[PDB]
Amino acid sequence: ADNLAEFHVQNQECDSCHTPDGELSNDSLTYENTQCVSCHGTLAEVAETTKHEHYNAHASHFPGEVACTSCHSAHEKSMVYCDSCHSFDFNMPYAKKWLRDEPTIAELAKDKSERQAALASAPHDTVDVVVVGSGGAGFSAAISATDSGAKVILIEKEPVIGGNAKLAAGGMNAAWTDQQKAKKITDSPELMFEDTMKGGQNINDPALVKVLSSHSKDSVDWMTAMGADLTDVGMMGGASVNRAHRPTGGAGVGAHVVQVLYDNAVKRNIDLRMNTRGIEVLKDDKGTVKGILVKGMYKGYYWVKADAVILATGGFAKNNERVAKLDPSLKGFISTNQPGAVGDGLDVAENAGGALKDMQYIQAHPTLSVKGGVMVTEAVRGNGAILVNREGKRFVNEITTKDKASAAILAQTGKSAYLIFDDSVRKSLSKIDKYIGLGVAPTADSLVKLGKMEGIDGKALTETVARYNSLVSSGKDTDFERPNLPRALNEGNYYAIEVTPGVHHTMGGVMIDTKAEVMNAKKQVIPGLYGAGEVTGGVHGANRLGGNAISDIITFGRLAGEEAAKYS
Ligand SMILES: Cc1cc2nc3c(=O)[nH]c(=O)nc-3n(C[C@H](O)[C@@H](O)[C@@H](O)COP(=O)(O)OP(=O)(O)OC[C@H]3O[C@@H](n4cnc5c(N)ncnc54)[C@H](O)[C@@H]3O)c2cc1C
Ligand code: HEM
Ligand code: HEM
Ligand code: HEM
Ligand code: HEM
Ligand SMILES: O=C(O)/C=C/C(=O)O
Ligand code: NA
To answer: Could you tell me the distance, in angstroms and rounded to a whole number, from the CA of residue 56 to the centre of ligand 7?
Structure first.
């Protein structure tokens, strides 16, 4: 067969997958994916038949219920979504090579000739609030608005939910939480504000950072009340104390939080539409929002009438062309992001009159796996790993901020470095097992053997770990002044992970005030238009602290959904 539908229709009718009238149920292909499930079973049942030792197309880290049509199209060959970051040995029937080619918002002007027709028609739906983006900010705003009594529509352009938020690892920063007190940590909203402003080089909008710190415990409480486990508190870079919350054992915060949020939207019957891209915010004659034009992948353009539109579309760190324009030193770097994190959401915000700020501040994550091409969480250092160069020596304070860690790693021989840790570090952070399963954490019972495996000076590496361990026992790092030395690397086996910097987060974005209201260049609110999440600028200044983005999207998503519901 040339395609999946063709293959099935040799022995089945069209209505085995389609509805009685044959029209597509919706842009999420709800009905249609139900029929795939009907015969092949759920994704977990399918996963039993496609097992590989360390990977499985149908059993991944993605949260929510991943539709089969995310990767299997019927009437045409389709792409494996995992190929956008990994290069697993897959044999999906009717596959084609991963290639992301999505028209920009500007390029969609060519659809003038279908957009006017959609805009001339009646709204397809009339609701109170449309949320754009199913990342942590978007679900948060959707839930919060719904909880406040607003009727919401939540759209996501991708086939899967979660954006970059589902990939988060190290934690969600928050101060003075019950979770911290349980672990004997002393912190305060004031110290979090201080660490943040300093980490952002005091560029951050003080009012936004005050919302960030002061709502942080409340956001942790709200997540936990919805079912989140944020009881593990770890250290991340540039933080005076451990304040990055994540599930028991050091599991990734991201997939968990998004799963909680998705479960919570589902419980509230939130109208969630996949493969639906927000294209244009619609304003009435007084310039207040009156809705949004969307482009449903399967059903075309249509508009939704609504009082408020909350843009929660995330950053543009996957868009290296846009990135390089603003920061030519990041040209050609690999990104840690999901494939649609390209800044189309910012273009929508700008076309609606929203002004942008701090766009030139683009954060590179210092430790992408060279081998796997994926982020390796900063919690690996925060839990006690060190960085060594090819010469087998330390070269930076591993818990300094991301801009300084990146530059120090890029200055080492070969422009990469190695995370080194033992089994005590590995056991304190279950996420590390994920790197081991990926094949990117080679191991050996001695550092001479580890270094010989990876091309690291073995006996210098041994001297390096012995010296670091005596600094840990002394209590002070006189070589690089790492302020927190939580463990000695001296338990069990040793592991090395080759790392180099990758493009990760865009701190700039649309200007919002403390109620998450989008502002124009004159600093005037655009009535009904809200922004929440990495799409906004001004929260993180020149350099975001690790763990501050999950804190940001919950706080600001939640706040935007409440403010939009009340605006009404
Ligand atoms: C690999 C990784 C690990 C990280 N770990 C952490 C961590 O541990 N702590 C921390 O603080 N930060 C962390 N960060 C950053 C953090 O994840 C966030 O920046 C991300 O959660 C921002 O959430 P968001 O809701 O703003 O956007 P995202 O989660 O990116 O979600 C936005 C959604 O909008 C959808 N969308 C975009 N444009 C449109 C459009 N026009 N129409 C419709 N839908 C649209 C996008 O496809 C996306 O799904 C990490 C980031 C990454 C990539
Ligand atoms: C879009 C919806 C569906 C998806 C994504 C899907 C997935 C697939 C794939 C990938 C294959 C293997 C293709 C190949 O070997 O070339 C397959 C085969 C098959 N499918 Fe589907 N399917 C869907 C709908 C259905 C439905 C509705 C039925 C039954 C009415 C069904 C029953 C089968 C059967 C019987 C086979 C052959 C192998 C077997 O005996 O299980 N599928 N399907
Ligand atoms: C000859 C039998 C079939 C006919 C005439 C038919 C008709 C169509 C049409 C007209 C569309 C596009 C509708 C639009 O764009 O609004 C479509 C899409 C779709 N059909 Fe079918 N269909 C048939 C069989 C199947 C089968 C067997 C499957 C699944 C195994 C299937 C699953 C889907 C899906 C998932 C879509 C959405 C887009 C895509 O994945 O290609 N159809 N079909
Ligand atoms: C319940 C949802 C889905 C159904 C019913 C379905 C159906 C199937 C079937 C029947 C096969 C052939 C495996 C076999 O020989 O038994 C298969 C293979 C495959 N599917 Fe799915 N699929 C689903 C979701 C997905 C998703 C969401 C993705 C990507 C994230 C995906 C990617 C693949 C790949 C890459 C293969 C080849 C497996 C390998 O080479 O290990 N599928 N699918
Ligand atoms: C359904 C699609 C995917 C599958 C089946 C898959 C598979 C895997 C596997 C097998 C691992 C090693 C640990 C584990 O077993 O979980 C892994 C790790 C990882 N993958 Fe994926 N992957 C998928 C999509 C993606 C995409 C598109 C990205 C980036 C946007 C990504 C980012 C990562 C990262 C950052 C890690 C490191 C460990 C962690 O953070 O948990 N994955 N993935
Ligand atoms: O876990 C990490 O490395 C990323 C943290 C962050 O971006 O805040
Ligand atoms: Na931003």
So the answer is: 33
Lay out the sheet containing 232-234: strands in order across.
172-173, 244-246, 232-234
Nearest to 276 by CA among 127, 382, 154: 154
The candidate with the shortest Cα–Cα distance to 136, out of 550, 540, 504, 546, is 550
- Ligand 5 pocket residue status of 437, Cβ below 6 Å: yes
Give the ligand whose atoms come closest to the C-alpha of residue 16: 2
CB 341 within 8 A of CB 316: yes
CA distances from 476 to 152, 280, 466, 472, 484 (A): 53, 55, 14, 7, 8
One-character DSSP codes across 15-68: GGTS-TT---S-TT-HHHHHHHHHHH--HHHHHTTS--SS--TTS-S--S---G
How far the first Cα of the chain sits from its last, in Å, is: 52
494-506 and 417-422: which strand pairing? antiparallel
| Whole-Å CA distances, 549 to 135, 213, 536 | 11, 12, 11
H-type helices in 177-252, by residue range? 178-182, 189-199, 206-225
SS percent in the chain: helix, strand, coil, step 5: 35, 20, 45
User: What DSSP designation does 69 have?
Assistant: G
For residue 8, give the ligand nearest its CA.
3
Rounded to the nearest angstrom, the distance between the alpha carbon of 57 and the centre of ligand 4 is 6
Ligand 3 pocket mutation, candidates 9, 17, 31, criterion most atoms within 8 A of CB: 17
Output the six-digit token pair for 245.
């919350």
Listed in sequence order, the DSSP H helices in 176-205 are: 178-182, 189-199
Q: 174-198 b/e with 16+ CB inside 10 Å = b?
A: bbbbebbeeeebebebebbbebbbb
Residues 6+ apart with CB under 8 A from 121: 302, 303
**Distance of alpha carbon 536 from its chain centroid, rounded?**
14
CA quadruple 133, 137, 143, 147: dihedral, nearest 10: -130
Atom of ligand 6 nearest to the CA of 377: 3
The residue whose C-alpha atom lies closest to atom 4 belonging to ligand 4 is 68
Q: What is the resolution of this structure in A?
A: 2.0
Residues 118, 300: Cα–Cα separation, whole Å:
9
Q: Could you tell me if the CB of 371 is within 6 A of ligand 2?
A: no
Question: Three-state secondary structure along 101-160?
Answer: CCCCCCHHHHHHHHHHHHHHCCCCEECCEEEECCCHHHHHHHHHHHHCCCCEEEECCCCC
Largest distance between two CA atoms of the chain: 75
Determination technique for this entry: X-ray
d(CA 52, CA 122): 50
| Domains of the chain in sequence order | 1-99 (1.10.1130.10), 103-359+506-568 (3.50.50.60), 365-502 (3.90.700.10)
